Design a protein around this ligand. Sequence first.
Ligand SMILES: Nc1ncnc2c1ncn2[C@@H]1O[C@H](COP(=O)(O)OP(=O)(O)O)[C@@H](O)[C@H]1O
Ligand SMILES: Nc1ncnc2c1ncn2[C@@H]1O[C@H](COP(=O)(O)OP(=O)(O)O)[C@@H](O)[C@H]1O
Ligand SMILES: Nc1ncnc2c1ncn2[C@@H]1O[C@H](COP(=O)(O)OP(=O)(O)O)[C@@H](O)[C@H]1O
Ligand SMILES: Nc1ncnc2c1ncn2[C@@H]1O[C@H](COP(=O)(O)OP(=O)(O)O)[C@@H](O)[C@H]1O
Ligand SMILES: Nc1ncnc2c1ncn2[C@@H]1O[C@H](COP(=O)(O)OP(=O)(O)O)[C@@H](O)[C@H]1O
Ligand SMILES: [Mg+2]
Ligand SMILES: [Mg+2]
Ligand SMILES: [Mg+2]
Ligand SMILES: [Mg+2]
Ligand SMILES: [Mg+2]
Lengths: 371, 371, 371, 371, 371
Amino acid sequence: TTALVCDNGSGLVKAGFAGDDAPRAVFPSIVGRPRHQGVMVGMGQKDSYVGDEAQSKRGILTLKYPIEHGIITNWDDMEKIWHHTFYNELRVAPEEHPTLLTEAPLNPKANREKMTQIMFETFNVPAMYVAIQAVLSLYASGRTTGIVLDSGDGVTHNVPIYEGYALPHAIMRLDLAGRDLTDYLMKILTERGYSFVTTAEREIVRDIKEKLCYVALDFENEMATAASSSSLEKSYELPDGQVITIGNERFRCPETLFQPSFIGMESAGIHETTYNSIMKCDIDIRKDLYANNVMSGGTTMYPGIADRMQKEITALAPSTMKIKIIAPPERKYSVWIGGSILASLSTFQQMWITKQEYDEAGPSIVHRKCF
Amino acid sequence: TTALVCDNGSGLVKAGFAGDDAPRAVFPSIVGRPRHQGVMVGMGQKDSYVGDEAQSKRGILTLKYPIEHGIITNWDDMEKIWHHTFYNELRVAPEEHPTLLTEAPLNPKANREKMTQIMFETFNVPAMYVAIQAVLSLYASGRTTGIVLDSGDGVTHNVPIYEGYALPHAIMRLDLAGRDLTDYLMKILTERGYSFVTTAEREIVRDIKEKLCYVALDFENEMATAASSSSLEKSYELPDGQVITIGNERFRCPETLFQPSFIGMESAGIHETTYNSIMKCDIDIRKDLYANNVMSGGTTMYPGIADRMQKEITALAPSTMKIKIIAPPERKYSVWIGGSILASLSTFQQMWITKQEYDEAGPSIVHRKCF
Amino acid sequence: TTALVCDNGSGLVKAGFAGDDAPRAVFPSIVGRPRHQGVMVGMGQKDSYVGDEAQSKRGILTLKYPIEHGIITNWDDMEKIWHHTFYNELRVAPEEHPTLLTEAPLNPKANREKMTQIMFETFNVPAMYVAIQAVLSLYASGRTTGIVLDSGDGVTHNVPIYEGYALPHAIMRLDLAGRDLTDYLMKILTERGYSFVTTAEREIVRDIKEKLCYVALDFENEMATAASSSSLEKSYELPDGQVITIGNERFRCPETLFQPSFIGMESAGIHETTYNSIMKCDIDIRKDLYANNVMSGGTTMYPGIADRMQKEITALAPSTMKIKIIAPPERKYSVWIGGSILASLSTFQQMWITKQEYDEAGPSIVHRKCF
Amino acid sequence: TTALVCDNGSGLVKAGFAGDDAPRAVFPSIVGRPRHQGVMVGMGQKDSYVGDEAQSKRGILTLKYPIEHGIITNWDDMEKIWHHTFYNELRVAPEEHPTLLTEAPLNPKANREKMTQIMFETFNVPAMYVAIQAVLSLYASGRTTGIVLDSGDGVTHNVPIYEGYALPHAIMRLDLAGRDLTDYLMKILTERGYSFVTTAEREIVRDIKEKLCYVALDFENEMATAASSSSLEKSYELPDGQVITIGNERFRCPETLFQPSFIGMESAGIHETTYNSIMKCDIDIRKDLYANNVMSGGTTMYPGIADRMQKEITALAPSTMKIKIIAPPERKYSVWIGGSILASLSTFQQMWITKQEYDEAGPSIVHRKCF
Amino acid sequence: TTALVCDNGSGLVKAGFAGDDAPRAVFPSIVGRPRHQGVMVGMGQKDSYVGDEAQSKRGILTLKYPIEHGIITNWDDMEKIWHHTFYNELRVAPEEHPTLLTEAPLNPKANREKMTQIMFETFNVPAMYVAIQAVLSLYASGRTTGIVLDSGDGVTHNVPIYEGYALPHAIMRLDLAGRDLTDYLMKILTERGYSFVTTAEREIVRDIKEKLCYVALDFENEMATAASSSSLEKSYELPDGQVITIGNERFRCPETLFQPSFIGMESAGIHETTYNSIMKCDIDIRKDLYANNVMSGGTTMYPGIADRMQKEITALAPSTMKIKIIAPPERKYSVWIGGSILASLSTFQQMWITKQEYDEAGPSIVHRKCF
Ligand SMILES: Nc1ncnc2c1ncn2[C@@H]1O[C@H](COP(=O)(O)OP(=O)(O)O)[C@@H](O)[C@H]1O
Ligand SMILES: Nc1ncnc2c1ncn2[C@@H]1O[C@H](COP(=O)(O)OP(=O)(O)O)[C@@H](O)[C@H]1O
Ligand SMILES: Nc1ncnc2c1ncn2[C@@H]1O[C@H](COP(=O)(O)OP(=O)(O)O)[C@@H](O)[C@H]1O
Ligand SMILES: Nc1ncnc2c1ncn2[C@@H]1O[C@H](COP(=O)(O)OP(=O)(O)O)[C@@H](O)[C@H]1O
Ligand SMILES: Nc1ncnc2c1ncn2[C@@H]1O[C@H](COP(=O)(O)OP(=O)(O)O)[C@@H](O)[C@H]1O
Ligand SMILES: [Mg+2]
Ligand SMILES: [Mg+2]
Ligand SMILES: [Mg+2]
Ligand SMILES: [Mg+2]
Ligand SMILES: [Mg+2]
C-alpha cells in the first residue's frame, strides 16, 4: 500500500511514508563505535551506536559515515542504519511496504546493485525503486524543466532536465560538498587558533558551519571589511562553554564552493559547473534552463548562496538570459519530498522493481529502468 | 461542401478551407522524436512531437522532415502530420470534406499514388485532387500566362503556362532550394566561427536566414564592400543570448540560388534555369513569358531576389523583351491561395477524384487527370 | 554464593558481604609491633597486633601501614591483615566465597598480581576480582557518568567515566592524600608548639584532623580573620588531658589539597587536577562531566571541601558550564558500597576470575579483564 | 632551403624537416601552469611548463590545450608551444626556413589568419603555407583518390579527393574526436568505480585509452559476452600502483565513434559520416571513393577500427561496391608525413606564401590559395 | 651580512649562523622558576633560569615550555629565551643580522604575527623571515620532492612537496609528538613501579626515552617476546643512583606514534597520516612521493622508526610503489640545516621581510609571502 520513501543520503537519513509532506525519521548517517575500552559491567553497553544514539554518545565513539562522496562504502554499517530506520525509527514492517531509495547520478553501478540486493534479501522488501536525487528534487519544486543543483554532504551535482527529459551527457558531478566544507573549517579554524581534530569535533564543526557560515556576495570585498572591522566577528558556544570567535572563516568556508582551489580541488566552482552543464545542453533549451535553476540540498541552505550564484552565473551567461534561481524553503528535504510525490503517483506504480522481477532478471534490472 | 486545401509542402504545412483568403493552420512539417531517454515518470511524455510541438521541444528532439526535395519519404511521419493537420489544427472531420493536395511537378509517380491511397484509406476523404503547386501559384496571381518560379524549402521549379496551357516539356526542376540554403549557412557560419550542428541548430539557422539574408544586386561588388566596411555586419540573437555577428554570409548564402556551384551543384542558377525554360518554349510566346515572370514560395521572400533576378534575366534575354517580374506580397502562401481559389471554382468541381472513382479505376486515376 | 567485598584501602580496611548496605568489618590497616622489650612473662604477649588491637595498644607499638600511596609494600603484613579480616572480623570461611578487592588506578601491575596470588594461594578463594575504586564509587552514586574524585589516605585520583566508558588517558593520580595531610599537621602543629613525633602521635593527629579541620572557602581571607580574632581557635583533648589549641592550622592543613606546594608537592591542587582531567576528555562530553563531579573517599569528608572545590572549578571552567558536585552522605564508604552493588549484579558474575582460570592462564589474567 | 613541417595538431605537436620520414619533435600540445602556490625559493620554478615538461610535472599543473576541436583558442599559449617547438625541440632558427602548418578543413578563417600573422611577425618565417590535414594524409598514402578520414584528438573529418580534386561540398566535419572519447572514459570509468577528475587524471585516462580500448566488431554481441565472462576484463597500472580493472568500457568507449549518441552527440557515427560524404559526391566517382577509404590520425589506431568500419560501410553501401579501407602503419603521423612529402615537391615551391607577398596582399592571401 | 638561523622549536632552541653546517647554540626551550622560597641571601639568586641553566638547577625549578604543540603560548618566557639565544649563547648583536625563524605549518596566524612583532620591536632585527620547518628539512636533504615527516617534541607534521611546489591541502598535522611520548612514559613507568611526577622528573624521563626506546618492527610479536624473556629488559641509571629496569615500555612508548589510541588520541598513526597525505596528493605524483619519504626531527631518531614505517606504508601502499624512506644522519637538525642553506642562497635574499617593509605594510606581510 504505502511506500517508504527513504532518502539514504550521506549525512542525514531521511525516511517517511509516501504521501507525507515531511520525513518522520530524520537522523544522521553515522555509526559510532566505542573509542575506549569500557568498564561498567552492568551498564548495557552496545558494540555500536547509530544515528541519534551516536550523537548523544559522540565523544566516546569513533564516528563513521558509511557513505562517502555519495558512495556506500561500509556496507555492514549501512545495513545497520537501514535496520534502525525501519525498525526503530519508523517502526514499520519493511516486508509489507515498497521502498524508494535514492542515488546521486554517476554513482558506481555496484552501489545500486549491492543496495538492491540488501533491500530484497535482508529486508524482504515487496518492491523497490532507486531514483536519482536531482530528479526527485525537481518533482518537489513541481517543475518539468530546470537545472537541479543538488548539493548535500556527500556530493554536489547538476542535472539538466528539460520537459521531463534528463540530459545525461550534461550531468555534472563534483565531489566537493558539505563534508569537505566541514573539513575545510577544521583547517581554517586551526588558523584562527582552535584545534578541532576528532570525529566528534568534526561533528561540532558541522554545527558551527550551519549557524555561522554565509556566502559573501563579493568575496574579495568581504575580505577587505572582514580584515578591517570586527562587525563580522561572531561568537559561538561549543558543547564545552569555550566560546569560539569566528570572522573571516564565516565566509571563507562556503566560498570554497565557488573557489574549490581553496581545498586543492582542481574543478571549477559550482557556478561554473552549473554553467558548463548548461553549455553542454543544446542551445535550443538553454534559455529555459537559465530561468529554472533549482537549488536544493543542505549546502544550499547557506545564507546568500542563491544571491551569490545568481550574480556569478549572470556574469557567465549572455546578458539577456534572465538567470533565475529557485531556492524554496524546505529545499533541504526536497529530495525526500520529491520521493513522497513520486511514490504517490499512479503512473509511477509501474516503475517498481518487484522481488519476483528482480529474482528473475537479476541485478542488471536496476539500471535497465533508469541510469 | 467546403474543401480543405492542404498545401503539404516540405517545410510548412499550410492548411485551411477553400474560400478563405489565408490558411488557418500553418505549422512546420516536422516530426520530432526524443533525442534523450526521459526520466520523469508522470510527465506525460510523447513518443513523437509534431509541428509546433516539435518546435517548442526542439532541443531534445531529433527533427525529421518527412518530405525531402519535394518527395515524401517518411510516409509514417507524413501520415502523422496530416493527422494533426486535420484533427488538432483545423479540427475538422476529414470524411465530410473534399481535399486538395499539392505537388511539385516531376515528383515520382509513387509519391502521388501513395499519398492518394492514404487520403482515401486513412482519412476516408470523400473526394480528393492533387494539383501542381506552380499552377496554383499562377491562379493566386490571377494570371493565365507566365513563368511560375516556385521555390520552397524542398525544391525550386519553373513551370511555363501560356493562356491556361502548361508546357510540360519546358518544366524545370532544381533541387537546390531553401533547405540547401539553410545548410549552406550552417557551413558558411562555421567559416565565421559558429558551430551549428544539430537539427535543432539547423532550425535556428533557418530563423537566421529569414531575418538577415538578402540578395546582393551585384554579388561581386557586394563582396568588395563587405570585405571593406562593417556596415553590412549585422548582429543576431539566438535562443541563447549568444549574439551572432554576420556579414558576408548575409548575401553569400542566397547567392547560391544564382551560383549553385557554391554548394557543388552543377546546375545553372535560377536566373538561367528560368531563362532556359523560356528558351524551350516556342518563340511565339516567349515575349509574354518574359513579361509575366511570377515568383512565389518562401525563398522568393529574400530582399532583392526580384531585383536581382530581373537584372540577371535582363542580361540573358534579348534587350527589348521587357522583363517583368511579379512578386506580390503574400506570395509565400500563393500556392495555398491558389488552392483556395481553385477549389472554390464551379468548373473545378468536375476535377475531383471521388472515393468511388478511385476504388473503381485504381491508383492510375491520379495521373490520368493531370501530370 | 555471597561475595566478600573487601576494600583493602590504605588506612581503613572495609570488608563485608555483597548485598549489605554497609561493611561489617571496618578497622585500620595497621600492623603494630612492640616498640619495647616486654617483661611480663605470662601476659600472653603477641609479636604483632592488628587493626583495632594496634589501636588499643598503640603507644607501645611501632605502627606500620602495609600500604603506602595505594601500593601494598609490606606484603607480609598485608597478608596478616587479610587473615584477620576474614577469620577474626568477618569470621567467614574465605574458601567458600568469591571476593572483590580494589585498587587505585595506575597502581603497579605487580601490586595486583601479588595480591591475586595471595587470594588464591593463601586463602583459596573460589573466585576473585579486582576493581578500580573510582569505578566502584560511581556505582555507589548510581551514575554512569561523572568525574570520580576518590581521595583516601593513600592516594587521590580522578577517573572520568562517561556512560559506562572509563577514559584511561585522562585518569589523574596524585599521591597527595590523607596521610600527607596528617603529616602536614604534625609539621604545622610543631609551629604552634606541639611536638607530635611517634607513629602513635601521628595517629593522634589523624583524630585531630578529622574533627577540627575544615576547608576555607577563601583561604586568604580566612587567614586574615584567623590572624585577627580568636573565633577560629578551637580546643582539642588528647588521650592525655593536655588540651591542644588549634587555629590557623584548622584550615591550613586541608588547604594543601588545593595548594600542594605547601608540602613541596609540584602538582597542581585537586581542583586543577580534576579540571585538567576533564580537559583531557573530548569536548563532546565535558559538559556532562562538569555536571557530575562525584566526590568520595575519606578526605572528601572535610567540611566545605565540596563548596570550595565548586568555587575553584567554577573559576577554572567556562562560565555557563554548570559545575555540580556530588558529595553524598556515606561517600566515605562509597567504594565499598559500590563493591557490594557490583558483586550483587547478575551481569557481573561473568567477571569473576576463577581459581581454575587463574591457574590455567596465569597472573596476566588480572589485567586482561580491566586495567 | 629545408622546410620545417609543423603539424600543429590538437594534442600532439609533430614537427620536423621536410625530407625526413618522421618528425623529430613529437610532444603534446599542452601548456601547464602551477596548480599550487610554490614554496621552494631557489628551485628555479617556471610560470608555465610546455609539452614534455608539462607531462613530467603534470600533477601540480593545470593542463590546458591551446587547441580545442581543431581551433586555436588560447593564442598566447599556442605561441609558446611554437616557440618551444622551434627553439628547444628542433633547435632551428625559424627565420631561415619556410614552414608548413596544417588545419582541419572548415576551421574558422580567423584561425588561419591569426596563425599566419604569428608566423610572419613573431617568428619571421621567410615563407609559409597552410595545408589541409586530410589532403596531406592522402599524399602520405601516395594516392590521388580517396576518402580521407582523419580523426585526431580535436576533430574528425572526411575529405573526398578525386584524382587530385578535393570536393569541398562533401567535406564532413565532426567534432566528436579523441578528446571526447577520453572524456567519455572518465565518465564511464566513474560507472565502474574510478574517480578520474583532474586534468592530470584526464591525461592518465588518455594513456588507458590508448592501451586497452579496442573496437568491437559487433558491439551488441560484444556486450553480451562482456557481461557474461571475465575474459574481456583487463588490468591497468596507474602512475600510482592502484590497478584499474576495465571490461565493458574497453569497447564502449571507442564505440562512441559509431554511436555518438553515447555522449549526447546528435550526429551520425563516422561510418555514416563517411558514407554520407560519398553520397554527396557525384555517382560517377563513388566507386573509386569506396575502394580508397583512407584512414589516418591517432584515433584510427584503435584495434579493429578498420574492420569495424569496413563492416559498417559494407552494410550501408550498395553491395558490389567493394569497400576497401586503407589503414597503413604509421597513419598516426600521416599528416606530418604528407607535409614532408609536399614540402619536398618541386612543384609545391610555388605555393609558398612569402613574407613579402603577405605584407603586400594582407591576411586574405592565406585563403586565396586553398580553402 | 650573515643571517642568524634560529630554529625556535618546542624543546630545543637551535641557533647559529647561516653558512654553518651546525648550530652553535643548542639548548632546551625551558624557562624555570624557583619551586621553593630561597634563603641564602648573598647567593645571587635569579628569578628565572633559562635553557642549560634550568637544566643544571632543574630540581628546584618549575620547568615551563613556552611552546606547546608548536604554539608559542608563554610569550614572556619565549622572549626571554630569544634574549639568551642572542646575547648569551651566540653573543651576537641581533640588530646587525637578518634572522630566520621557523614554524610548524598550520600554526595559528597570531603565532607568527606576535613572533614577528617581537623580532622587530624587541630585537630590532634588520630583516626577518619565517619559514616552514618541513620545507627547510627538505632543503637539508637536498631534494625538491618528497614527503617531509617532521616530528619534533611539539608537533608531528607531513608536508608534501613536489618539485618545489608545496601542496597545502595535503598537509597533515598531528599534535601527537615527542612530548606526548615522554608523558606516556611517565604513565607507563608508573605501571612498572616508578613514580615520575615533577617537571624535573618529566625531563629525566626524556633522557630515558632517548636512550632506551626503540621501535618494534612488529609490535605484537615484540610484546610476545618481551613478556617471555628478559632479553629486552634494560637497566638505566637516574641522576639518583636508583637503577630503573625497563622492558615492555622500551617499545610500547614509541609505538604510540603508530597506534595513538594508546594515549587516547583519535588520529591514525603517523604511517597512516603520511599515507593519507599522499592520497590527498594527485595520483600523478604519488609515485615520486612514495620514493622520497623524508623523515626528520628528533622523534625520528628512534631506532628502527624508519624500518617500521617502511613496513607499515609498504602494507598500505599499492605494491610496486617502491616505498623509500630517507632518514639521514643529523636529521635531528635538518630543519636548522635547511635554514642555514636557505639563508645562504642568493635567490632567497629577496624573501626577507625588512623592518621598513613590515612597518609600512603591517603584520599581514608575514603571511603574504608564504602560508
Ligand atoms: N542550515 C544549514 N546551513 C548550511 N549547511 C547545512 C544546513 N543544514 C544542513 N547543512 C549541510 O548539508 C549537509 C546535509 O544536508 P543533506 O543534503 O540532507 O545531506 P545528505 O543529503 O548528504 O544527507 C551537511 O553538510 C550539512 O552540514
Ligand atoms: N522571409 C523569408 N525570407 C527568406 N526565406 C524564407 C522566408 N520565409 C520563409 N522562407 C523560406 O522558405 C521556405 C519555406 O517556405 P515554403 O515555400 O512554404 O516552403 P514549403 O512550400 O517547401 O513548405 C523555407 O526555406 C524558409 O526558410
Ligand atoms: N570525617 C573526616 N574528616 C576528614 N578526614 C577524614 C574523615 N574521615 C576519614 N578521613 C580521612 O580519610 C582517610 C581514610 O578514609 P578512606 O578513604 O577509607 O581511606 P582509605 O580508602 O585510604 O582506606 C584518612 O586520612 C582519614 O583521616
Ligand atoms: N595507439 C592509440 N590508440 C588509440 N588512440 C590513440 C593512439 N595513439 C594516439 N591516439 C589518440 O589520437 C589522438 C592524438 O593523435 P593525433 O592524431 O596526433 O592528434 P592530433 O593530430 O589531434 O594532435 C589522441 O586522442 C590520442 O589519444
Ligand atoms: N636520540 C633520540 N631518540 C629519541 N628521541 C629523541 C632523540 N633525540 C631527541 N629526541 C626527541 O626529539 C624531541 C626534540 O627534538 P627536536 O626535533 O629538536 O624538537 P623540537 O624541534 O620540537 O625542538 C624531543 O622529544 C626529544 O626527546
Ligand atoms: Mg541528499
Ligand atoms: Mg511550397
Ligand atoms: Mg579508599
Ligand atoms: Mg591531426
Ligand atoms: Mg623542530
